Amino acid sequence: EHQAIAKMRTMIEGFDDISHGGLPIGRSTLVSGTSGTGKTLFSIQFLYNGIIEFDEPGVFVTFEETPQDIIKNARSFGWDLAKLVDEGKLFILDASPDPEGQEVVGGFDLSALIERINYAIQKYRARRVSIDSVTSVFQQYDASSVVRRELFRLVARLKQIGATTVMTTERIEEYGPIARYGVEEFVSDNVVILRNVLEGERRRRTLEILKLRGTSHMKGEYPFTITDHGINIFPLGAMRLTQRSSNVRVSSGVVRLDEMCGGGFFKDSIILATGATGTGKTLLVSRFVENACANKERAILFAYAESRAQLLRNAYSWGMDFEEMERQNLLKIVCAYPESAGLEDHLQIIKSEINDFKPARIAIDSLSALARGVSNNAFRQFVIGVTGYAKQEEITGLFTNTSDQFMGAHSITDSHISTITDTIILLQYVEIRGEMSRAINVFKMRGSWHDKAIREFMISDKGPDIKDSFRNFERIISGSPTRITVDEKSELSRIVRGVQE
């Protein structure tokens, strides 16, 4: 064919993007990785999606696990492969060693295997093939050079059958040799790397497509997650910056804050609320979610510092109630420690809830808690992920960032997120006459006017009460101001033009 390589859609969430179409049809694809990375799953989900979506028959070849365990373990994702075997759509070819014993099973055992596969293909008329762990076979007497020739024989014979094949290899070091015998990478037309990279004490699942002979593909490690729906990769780079926008205004919950912003927040905009600890970020978040519920809209709250009851207690002390909003089903709370997962996991925990409850407002309280030790690079990618998702879903997102230094915030966000967010709200402490006092301040708005005043504000049983500025103070930002006005008034005066010592 004069056409370039065509790809077959794996229908695995994300992989079709990173691979730019799927898998090169007619060729084999090497899915290599350390233990427990999701190799076996990738091969099964590939075959499974082949039957469900495109009615393409499949053949699975196992060398270690028993077909019973394959069907058993695949029930974790809700895949009745057994039925797919019954319907003649799926065929599991058992090639795992019988527990007894037989000498020399690497000679004509492979050449017979290839013809076993060919029969399995011809009989079931299968388009997709998965061969889990081709490593176990060569783990008998063979070494290096033996593997390369024998592996090439299987890749070659498979290609002539026209099978879109997916093979599997094991590893020892995360960033060491791509495959065991340091040879499989060069024989295979396609190479895919599954990593369970440590870093700290958490684990980050990454997928990389090393090479696709004949086509294009996204380069680098893209994070993924194994869930009850299977492999889920987030192409945080294929995300097209075409997110819609609107001049429709929504309320922050605080009336004056709507006026300080030139008619309330925008619907299609991300809101950041910085400031030291204790200023009142959680409160602005509370009042924010309160608005959507009152307008018969759905809204979610993600807390990463407070308990579920301490989030209701302090809220009830502000008069507002989340109970009734939960009772009438318009408000949803999550609450989870940042250490309970990695950033790759949390992103999906959010994203999943967004599809189920389908809110109109998102309030992630404390992004600063998701930078706890996590690299500044792995963080930005996550932030952009949430922001870049809530934007294309048209959801007003209010975020929160506790500044690590009270009184003297030389920079807005210490993790340099300030560029991504549209609307910025700055809260700060102002030492007035030996007293700490709040000072709400709208700092940026990308479509509206916006007030430019550094207004003080009190909080009580009602909370956010916005008063007047500090027109008689220098160096407000510093936190330790200075009274001016060297003039007086009222009645007077005389003249007596003289000194007068």
Add this chain to the structure above:
Amino acid sequence: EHQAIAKMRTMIEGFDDISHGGLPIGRSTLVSGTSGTGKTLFSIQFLYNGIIEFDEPGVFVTFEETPQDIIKNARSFGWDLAKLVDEGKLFILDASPDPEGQEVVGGFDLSALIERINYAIQKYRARRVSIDSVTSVFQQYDASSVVRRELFRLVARLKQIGATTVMTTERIEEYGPIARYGVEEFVSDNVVILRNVLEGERRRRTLEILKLRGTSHMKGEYPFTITDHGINIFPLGAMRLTQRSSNVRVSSGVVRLDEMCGGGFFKDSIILATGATGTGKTLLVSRFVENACANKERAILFAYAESRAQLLRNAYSWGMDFEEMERQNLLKIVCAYPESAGLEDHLQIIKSEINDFKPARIAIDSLSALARGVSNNAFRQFVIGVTGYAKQEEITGLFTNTSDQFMGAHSITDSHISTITDTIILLQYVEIRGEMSRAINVFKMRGSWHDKAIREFMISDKGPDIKDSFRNFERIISGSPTRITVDEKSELSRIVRGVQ
């Protein structure tokens, strides 16, 4: 020969400069690299160029990939190698093992292959040869020393025919040994090393010519990009300081700013708009991109933070419509996440997007949104790439850098780019009477006078409005100034009022 070493051009974009003419005539060149680097592509593109550009026939010796597979692979880049093998200009030598099961195939398999290769040379009068993956033949039972002889016999034989050859070798570690058996490097007269360096979940593709026995070459790594057009190398050293300069002026979109610059921006100059987030920038950028269309010039806005629609939402809220000038084919937005590629790729996208549309003005919103995750050096040389290209191709370019710390920042650019640009526009925050007012300063203009005052300005539905400076103040640059009393200054009168 009594003369110097003649080099045959490879026509690989960028490689000829690095190799100072191309590959040495009648000699071998080792192109080593790990999986997915670009070895096979380099060798194919080497032969394919000689046929189309120089009418120099080529023989491609394969060891693993079947011929008919290699044919379909080159079709990725729109290359009909099936046509070239049919025209007797290219020949794919199939030395791949049979898909059956023989072992007594080679008792003289080296001298046998050489006679085959040498037969194909004189048969097609080939001047260029590419031996793809010579490693995949020693993977029978050979050791390290055994390779040194079987290579040296093949290398010497091809040198006796007088053919310029490219031998491909594979490897595991990126910076460890150069070839598999740690032998191939010294056998070949020429050593090219391809890499796919990772460094933090990304992949930078770099070429390096380790050695060229005989002549000189550019020393070190150089970033390259495998695209639809094949290999594209950026030789940032081959770009010498020879870009024309002019004195013709252009407008920033803000007429008042043009006065502050003493007549407006220079045409062949790089302008930078540094300022904390929320100052101007995108407003300044927008106004700058508008001036082209009214002057009927083409402009390109590379956005790296906001969507294509949000820009329109903000532009239409400052007057200026982007729709019309896009319909007029005078304006082009781009929009792409910084993590949607590599610095090497963004440079090529920009370079290509310039050629296709041919703009007179360029606006790259937020360079600071490109240093995200990247090292300083990889970023610094990227800036020199886009800056130098806008200079040599003679284009006015406005850039943007968001300083991390608002009010108190004592460095213009955090990544220290200052010395590269020709004009630095500075925006900042000034706390006046418990409020957040803006200010615009023209920090430098390399060839003009420019106003040296820190004027404040407003942002409205009609745009910016540069006003009066902060004369009755001090410590402006620190964000939180001083009211200077003031002063006094006591409403005139004879003796005042009291003292008392």
